[PDB]
Amino acid sequence: KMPASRYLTDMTLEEMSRDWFMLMPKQKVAGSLCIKMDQAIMDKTIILKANFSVIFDRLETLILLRAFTEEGAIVGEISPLPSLPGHTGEDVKNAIGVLIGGLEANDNTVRVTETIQRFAWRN
Amino acid sequence: KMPASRYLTDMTLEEMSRDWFMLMPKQKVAGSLCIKMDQAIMDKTIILKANFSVIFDRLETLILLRAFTEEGAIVGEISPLPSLPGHTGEDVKNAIGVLIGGLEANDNTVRVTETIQRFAWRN
C-alpha cells in the first residue's frame, strides 16, 4: 500500500533552488548521499537547514540539507543521488556528521535547526 | 518578539518552481493575492495543492497554491504579491473560492488537499 508524502522545510523556495559554487571544492559520496563543502570558508557561524518528506507527523526522507552563514551564503549541501538506492536514516546522520566535522575543522561554529535534531533523535 | 518560521507543502520542489502558461488567461488581484487561471482547461480533474508557512504546528501564511490535473499540468495559481501588505486568512479563503468557482464553470472536478482544508477550517 501507499500513503502520499508532504514536505517540511526550514528553507524558503529561493534558499533551496538557489545555485551556489565553492571556491575550494570538497565532495564525498557517503551512503547514497552527496556531501558538498567549500573548504575556503573559515571562522563563520553556520546554520544547517533541511527539507524532509513527512508522513503522519513524522519525518521520513531527507530531500535536501544546506549549510548557511549568518549573511545567508550557502557553504555546504547534503543531497540524495537519484541513480543510487534510497538512503537510510544512519546514512543521513553520518552525512551530517561528516559536514559538521569538515566545517568545524576550518574553525566554524556549526548549529542545526530543530527539524534536523528531531530527525536525528528518532532516525 | 517573533519565532522562526518553517514551511509545510503538498508540492515537490519541481511542482513549485516549474514555469507554466495559460492559452486563455484570467488573472485577478483579490486581497494581496494574485489569482491566475487557464480558461482553456475543461472537463478535467483538478487538485489544489499548497505551501504554507508553519509556526507552532499551525499554518499561518500562504506561500503558494497551485492547481494540477491528474496528468500533472499546472492550470491555476494563487500567490502573494510582496509589494502589497500581508494577505489575511479571509483573502486566502476568497481566492480559493474564486479559483474553484472559475474552474468548475468550465466543467471541472476540483478537489483540495487536506492542508488547504485544515487551513480554511481554522483560518
Can you give the residue ranges of every domain in chain A?
1-123
- Residue showing cell 544546506: A66
Do residue B6 and residue A115 have CB atoms under 8 angstroms apart?
A: yes
Report which of A46, A42, A43 is spatially closest to residue A113, judged by C-alpha positions: A46
- CB atoms < 10 A from the CB of B2, how many? 5
With beta carbons under 8 A apart, name residues in chain B contacting A9.
Answer: 6-7, 9
Cβ pairs bridging A and B (under 8 Å): 33
Q: Are B63 and B54 contacting, i.e. CB atoms less than 8 angstroms apart? A: no
Method: X-ray
- Chain centroid, CA A52 distance in Å: 10
Q: Which of B6, B17, B54 sits opposite A13 (nearest CB)?
A: B17
Query: SS3 letters for A59-90?
Result: EEEEEEEEEEECCCCEEEEEEECCCCCCCCHH
CATH superfamily of A1-123: Influenza virus non-structural protein, effector domain (3.30.420.330)
Largest CA distance in chain B: 49
- Residue showing cell 502573494: B80
Q: What's this structure's resolution in Å?
A: 3.1
- Rounded to whole angstroms, how far apart are CA atoms A88 and B37? 41
Indicate the DSSP class of residue B101. Answer: H
Residue numbers followed by a gap, chain A, C–N over 2.5 Å: none
- Rounded to whole angstroms, how far apart are CA atoms B10 and A14? 17
Instruction: Give the phi and the psi of residue B62 in degrees, each rounded to 5.
Output: -75, 130
Do residue B9 and residue A6 have CB atoms under 8 angstroms apart?
A: yes
- Rounded to whole angstroms, how far apart are CA atoms A106 and A40? 8
- Rounded to whole angstroms, how far apart are CA atoms B123 and B115? 12
Residue-level length of chain A: 123
Do residue A17 and residue B17 have CB atoms under 8 angstroms apart?
A: yes
A-chain residue closest to B8, CA distance: A8
